[PDB]
Amino acid sequence: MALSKVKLNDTLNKDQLLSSSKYTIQRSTGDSIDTPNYDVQKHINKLCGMLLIT
């Protein structure tokens, strides 16, 4: 009754902390990244096949 009510919820407290940050970091991945669009998809698939038949 008395002591059995005393506990600390650490797992959920920690989630609550990481979920509720008021600030954010941002990383600089590298100099470039290629973002191929839908229009190029068929050509990339073709290129993949070239590797598979080799």
Place this chain on the structure above:
Amino acid sequence: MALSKVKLNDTLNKDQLLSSSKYTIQRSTGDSIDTPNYDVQKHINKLCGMLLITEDANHKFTGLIGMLYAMSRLGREDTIKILRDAGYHVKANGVDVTTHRQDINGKEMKFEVLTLASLTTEIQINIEIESRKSYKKMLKEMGEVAPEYRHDSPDCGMIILCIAALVITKLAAGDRSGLTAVIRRANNVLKNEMKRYKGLLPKDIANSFYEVFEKHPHFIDVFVHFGIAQSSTRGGSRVEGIFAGLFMNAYGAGQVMLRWGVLAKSVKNIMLGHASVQAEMEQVVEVYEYAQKLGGEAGFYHILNNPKASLLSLTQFPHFSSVVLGNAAGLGIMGEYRGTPRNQDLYDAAKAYAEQLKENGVINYSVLDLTAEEL
């Protein structure tokens, strides 16, 4: 009934008071502070790497340089915002990259430097000079430098901030006493990184971070919120996964006594029944529930010097503290912990019972029921 209803809630009353101030103080941090933006981040990482490839590197400035990376991850605006939230007046200092021309060894040379209040463009080039020396030597040894060994590796910034996180871990004691523990862990956890960087000297960088935190105590706030923002992240390199893991080991520093309490309750240590401990209970619950109410932010209260952390002390309850600490003793978890029981008789009794507990595990069959058991 009559008297059992009389109580005073002091722990929560005190929180209520500090939470509801109608006025505020503001501190004047110093003359300048550099707030590197996202755009500078890659260059700072590069500079971090230069330190890591430099064998027997001078790590005096590494602490400060690490803080700069962290701030360049938060971004100029986010970093100022966290300073102002903490309450410090901020002379923000914009950080740009300029080229510098200087003749080293007679021959004139170009260098990529940052405009920094904290760092002379002199001592900057000196890191790049020293790095090149350790680099050409590295190139001679293995013929060709792999990408994991160079100062380019995206990990470099975060690698340095790893021993920073470890410094935060032991910052609970407030002095340099965690240092040997910091080294120990940096050696097991980070052993792979130390293999790729001759300049990853734990003792030295750990000292340089202790240095920057002690000197500029507002950075300790900045770093804590950076780490939080870094641990908020959705995914990341194994190193960032290491950083976050280490950083979070510091959640709940200074409140070890609190967790050892939950333990004493969990193992049902007999000395909790003692009359003079039962007398304290009413209040010891008050504080545990206050911890609960506070939630996540609470864990770091001791690392930042948040006045409200005094409130989580179980010191105010000598009889309970003593049996809790004795329980932890008898279960062999304390030491070389420097906490002292205020009640030797209770501590000894709790320790004695605790030591006896690990000896006999009795199987409790009423947690899981079965309609037919032959055995």
Place this chain on the structure above:
Amino acid sequence: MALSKVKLNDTLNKDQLLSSSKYTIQRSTGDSIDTPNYDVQKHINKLCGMLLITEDANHKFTGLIGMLYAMSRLGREDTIKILRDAGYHVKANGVDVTTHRQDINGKEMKFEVLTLASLTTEIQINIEIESRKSYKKMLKEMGEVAPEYRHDSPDCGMIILCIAALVITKLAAGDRSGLTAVIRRANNVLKNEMKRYKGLLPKDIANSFYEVFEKHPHFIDVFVHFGIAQSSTRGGSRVEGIFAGLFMNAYGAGQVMLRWGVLAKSVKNIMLGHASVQAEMEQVVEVYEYAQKLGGEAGFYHILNNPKASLLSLTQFPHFSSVVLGNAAGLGIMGEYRGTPRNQDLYDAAKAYAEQLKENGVINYSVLDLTAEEL
């Protein structure tokens, strides 16, 4: 049933009356008051340090100077706002830094001084003159002065406000009687600081603060709210962590009798069952619940002279007071406390039972249940 329903709630009725006044008084504090703004804060800190490095420093003005630092942390606007909230008409006095030219030892010199109603630009330079003397002597002794020893250290302002906090601690009694207790604590708690500053003389500064509080009693309000605003803080230097801790030791000064009540209930002191104590209970609960309702602000009611503090007195209940004080006696917590029981017979009985309580801790097994215990 019939008569048991008849009661008068006096404690809460009285609060209700003082809370709901339709009119207000306003006091005319004096001719001027200096309200230093954030911009002056660093200079005041510097001036504080000058006092701390001065060996055998004259601490007459240190009390007043401390108040100035605190006000320069609150800021001109926040500081006026707290004066007006307290109800005092304020002749605000703007604080600017001007240069002063005067020939000391024949040679003409420059000085950085503040335009202050309270402080002559004469007695200001005298602190800087005296500091330089103790500084060149300090430079001769250790060859080079470390940053922890100089008047630059960002701690200096807050260090002085530490013994100020300690003065608040013992201000409950209203006289200088706390002084020896103040010194005692300043010596254990602040021993590190006293090592770095030859001018950190507790007796002297404590007297200087007592002086400024007694003389200008509105400052005691200002300081209390500063300390609250300082304890609201999110993080801070170890010194600010010390300040906050000490400041909060004063929460609940004057209401020690109240906490010793909760104690008497907690240890289940038998003399609480006595018929003539049971008669008081109905009302003694009224006051404890009033304390509860009031919340945080209540703790400081005695330090500021808030009329509503009279209401928390347990003095009005002689029989209860006596057993509570006797309980505290028998548990060896009172003394050299100068409270007297109004019922010697009860006090003695409570003390006697209390003394017997510490002798036998009986283990109570019905707080934690186990489905199978061999022992």
Place this chain on the structure above:
RNA sequence: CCCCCCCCCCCCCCCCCCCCCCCCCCCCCCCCCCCCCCCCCCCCCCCCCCCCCCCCCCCCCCCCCCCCCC
């Protein structure tokens, strides 16, 4: 048809209060250990098979209601 008696009310005493009593008073910063995490294996599926089938409209009588008294 309904209806039908009697009948104003009131009437004494009486201000209220009155004692004692500020309050407070001790002690006490806090903290201190250890510790990343993780690690096996593994696609999923796999048969049979439309449904339905009969009978079968519904209906059919009797009957206004009302009527006293007051």
